[PDB]
Amino acid sequence: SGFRKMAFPSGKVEGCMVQVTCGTTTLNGLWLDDVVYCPRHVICTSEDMLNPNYEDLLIRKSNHNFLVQAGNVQLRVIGHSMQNCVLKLKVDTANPKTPKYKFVRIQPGQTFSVLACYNGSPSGVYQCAMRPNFTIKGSFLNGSCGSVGFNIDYDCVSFCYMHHMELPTGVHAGTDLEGNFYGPFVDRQTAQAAGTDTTITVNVLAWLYAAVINGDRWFLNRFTTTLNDFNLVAMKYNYEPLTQDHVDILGPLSAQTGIAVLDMCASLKELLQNGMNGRTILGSALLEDEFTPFDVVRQCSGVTFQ
Amino acid sequence: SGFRKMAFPSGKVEGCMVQVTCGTTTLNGLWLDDVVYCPRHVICTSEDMLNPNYEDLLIRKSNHNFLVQAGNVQLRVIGHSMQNCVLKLKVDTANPKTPKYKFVRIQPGQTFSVLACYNGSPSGVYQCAMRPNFTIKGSFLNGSCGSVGFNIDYDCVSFCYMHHMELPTGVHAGTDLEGNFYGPFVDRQTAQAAGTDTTITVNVLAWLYAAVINGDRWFLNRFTTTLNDFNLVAMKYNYEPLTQDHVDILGPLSAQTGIAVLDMCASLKELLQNGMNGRTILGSALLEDEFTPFDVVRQCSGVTFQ
Ligand SMILES: *C(=O)[C@H](C[C@@H]1CCCNC1=O)NC(=O)[C@H](CC(C)C)NC(=O)[C@@H](NC(=O)c1ccc([N+](=O)[O-])cc1)C(C)C
Numbered sequence: 280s281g282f283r284k285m286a287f288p289s290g291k292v293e294g295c296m297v298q299v300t301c302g303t304t305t306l307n308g309l310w311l312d313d314v315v316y317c318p319r320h321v322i323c324t325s326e327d328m329l330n331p332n333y334e335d336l337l338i339r340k341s342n343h344n345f346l347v348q349a350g351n352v353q354l355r356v357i358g359h360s361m362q363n364c365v366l367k368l369k370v371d372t373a374n375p376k377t378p379k380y381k382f383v384r385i386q387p388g389q390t391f392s393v394l395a396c397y398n399g400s401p402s403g404v405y406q407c408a409m410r411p412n413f414t415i416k417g418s419f420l421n422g423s424c425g426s427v428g429f430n431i432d433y434d435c436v437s438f439c440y441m442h443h444m445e446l447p448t449g450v451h452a453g454t455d456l457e458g459n460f461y462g463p464f465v466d467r468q469t470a471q472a473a474g475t476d477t478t479i480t481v482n483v484l485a486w487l488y489a490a491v492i493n494g495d496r497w498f499l500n501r502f503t504t505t506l507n508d509f510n511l512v513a514m515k516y517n518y519e520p521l522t523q524d525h526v527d528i529l530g531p532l533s534a535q536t537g538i539a540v541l542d543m544c545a546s547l548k549e550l551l552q553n554g555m556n557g558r559t560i561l562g563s564a565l566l567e568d569e570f571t572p573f574d575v576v577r578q579c580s581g582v583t584f585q
Numbered sequence: 586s587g588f589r590k591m592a593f594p595s596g597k598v599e600g601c602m603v604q605v606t607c608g609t610t611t612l613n614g615l616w617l618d619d620v621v622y623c624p625r626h627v628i629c630t631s632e633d634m635l636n637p638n639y640e641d642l643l644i645r646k647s648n649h650n651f652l653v654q655a656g657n658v659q660l661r662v663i664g665h666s667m668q669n670c671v672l673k674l675k676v677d678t679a680n681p682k683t684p685k686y687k688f689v690r691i692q693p694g695q696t697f698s699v700l701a702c703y704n705g706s707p708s709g710v711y712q713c714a715m716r717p718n719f720t721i722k723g724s725f726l727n728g729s730c731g732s733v734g735f736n737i738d739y740d741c742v743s744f745c746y747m748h749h750m751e752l753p754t755g756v757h758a759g760t761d762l763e764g765n766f767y768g769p770f771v772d773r774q775t776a777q778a779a780g781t782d783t784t785i786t787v788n789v790l791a792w793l794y795a796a797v798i799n800g801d802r803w804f805l806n807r808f809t810t811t812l813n814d815f816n817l818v819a820m821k822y823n824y825e826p827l828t829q830d831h832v833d834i835l836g837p838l839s840a841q842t843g844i845a846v847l848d849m850c851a852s853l854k855e856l857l858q859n860g861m862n863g864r865t866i867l868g869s870a871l872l873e874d875e876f877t878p879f880d881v882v883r884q885c886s887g888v889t890f891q
């Protein structure tokens with residue numbers, strides 16, 4: 280028993296990280312087959328990051344302006360192209376450690392692991408959610424750009440996030456691996472504020488189920504609620520509306536615990552209106568919203584990958 | 586910016602995990618060079634876990650009673666010995682993926698990453714703290730024994746924990762890699778008194794320093810405190826008493842931020858006595874105690890957000 284914020288094992292992605300340097304700018308790239316993917320702003324200069332003309336700047340870049348270092352091996356760039364906000368550097372050698380992989384674009388409310396890297400060297404792994412306002416609350420310093428987010432399904436790595444920038448509120452924004460930003464952001468050092476963030480209601484409910492599974496049951500009551508009456512209360516506390524699709528996705532956790540979804544909603548309604556009365560749930564005084572229902576089932580059943 | 590509970594990248598440890606089966610009991614083993622390390626209770630059957638004579642069970646076993654599997658490859662056991670609570674199975678093949686490594690025994694309050702494994706395959710990775718009473722608050726199901734905890738310094742893995750059991754309170758206990766239990770515990774299914782679990786004060790202080798480094802000072806104040814006046818408040822709130830040894834460990838964070846250790850203690854004392862009043866620190870409403878001073882320096886910017 281026990282419930283932890285758990286990241287995917289990172290070994291398959293560790294073997295894909297490289298250092299990419301252009302001019303005096305260094306960041307990380309992702310080496311899959313004979314292509315290295317990295318944020319296109321590696322080609323900018325300090326003097327240019329206000330509103331870079333990326334297409335123009337790339338014209339004046341040759342293959343040998345890109346230094347790609349994979350551990351002890353320098354990779355030769357034999358071709359370069361730009362796809363939206365990512366650069367694709369074709370290289371001499373196919374990565375022998377390339378896993379089975381897909382590029383996916385995730386929905387807000389979904390979770391993924393981030394492999395934080397610096398100078399092509401992985402330094403940490405942690406679990407994140409795509410916020411409703413398309414930001415992530417990551418932990419990224421200078422040099423972290425090109426770090427990637429991913430999920431693992433059996434033996435296949437689904438890459439969903441590449442890191443590009445930090446917002447003034449200290450949260451983070453990036454692209455999918457096709458270079459398309461999540462949310463209304465652009466890769467320029469301009470004035471950019473994210474929409475108001477909301478709590479991911481279906482994830483909070485999933486985590487209350489995790490708590491019950493792990494013996495923490497004090498918040499269960501004998502009240503009932505309809506979906507509409509729950510959503511009338513939840514919206515006033517800045518929670519996302521709960522849809523019928525969300526209720527369906529909570530079906531398996533409901534069957535396992537014997538607690539109806541709308542009964543769990545009633546317990547959450549009491550927590551919102553009355554507070555915790557000084558208590559915690561799974562050690563938290565705030566309600567956790569970065570576990571999906573799939574995250575809870577997977578962890579509580581010991582699903583394995585590699 | 587940002588601050589996340591970050592685990593070490595798990596790839597170096599994933600390459601070491603194997604499955605060990607004896608009779609009908611399967612758990613995880615750690616394959617380093619030509620030795621597989623695993624918990625000695627792999628040789629137990631369900632009916633004799635109340636008072637197993639481990640040197641009763643082991644003399645009855647031959648090398649070929651141990652089935653060791655790495656991937657789809659059987660490893661042939663050519664020798665075995667018991668050291669404290671761990672079994673050492675000599676195998677006929679050195680692990681080609683053995684990293685540089687050490688075995689270290691850590692102190693209460695210190696942290697490590699756990700690669701939770703089932704049947705020799707990894708399920709996930711997360712960061713843990715050794716509690717003051719030598720337990721850990723993990724996520725371990727049936728079959729997780731032999732999962733290990735570790736730190737990585739450059740490319741040397743320091744293994745410090747191997748998982749053995751869950752206590753009746755839902756917390757977890759295990760050994761160092763020489764098989765010595767952390768805490769006054771033994772590998773049998775009998776009631777064993779545990780010390781009381783207090784909050785790791787030096788780690789809370791380190792995390793307040795992290796909040797300052799990242800740009801937040803709202804919780805500071807002008808008082809100072811003596812060590813003893815602080816510890817009187819600490820014990821009211823179930824915090825571990827702070828020693829001069831602990832104060833010395835916070836030296837680097839104190840110097841980096843310009844806040845004397847006993848001034849941060851005065852700040853913590855006021856947070857405990859007055860609560861948070863709806864505010865948060867690094868996103869938390871409860872003070873975090875699973876970051877050591879070293880963890881903070883490893884994750885935070887070397888440049889304080891002044
Ligand atoms: C890549 O490595 C680097 C990572 C950043 C660096 C700062 C610390 N944490 C990180 O995650 N990314 C960049 O340097 C990126 C380059 C651009 C996209 C070309 N720049 C930023 O992240 C900057 N953020 C902004 O410039 C920004 C400023 C103001 C506003 N605003 O609403 O006013 C929005 C965005 C960093 C401040 C350098």
Ligand SMILES: *C(=O)[C@H](C[C@@H]1CCCNC1=O)NC(=O)[C@H](CC(C)C)NC(=O)[C@@H](NC(=O)c1ccc([N+](=O)[O-])cc1)C(C)C
Pocket residue numbers: 280612626629634725726727728729730731749750751752753757770771772773774775776777778
């Ligand atoms: C190994 O895989 C397995 C892991 C356990 C399994 C249950 C779920 N979570 C885990 O971490 N370890 C065991 O099965 C272990 C083998 C013994 C130690 C020979 N048994 C247990 O973990 C049981 N624990 C106890 O019975 C127990 C009772 C009291 C104390 N104590 O110190 O007071 C310690 C252990 C579980 C009930 C299965």
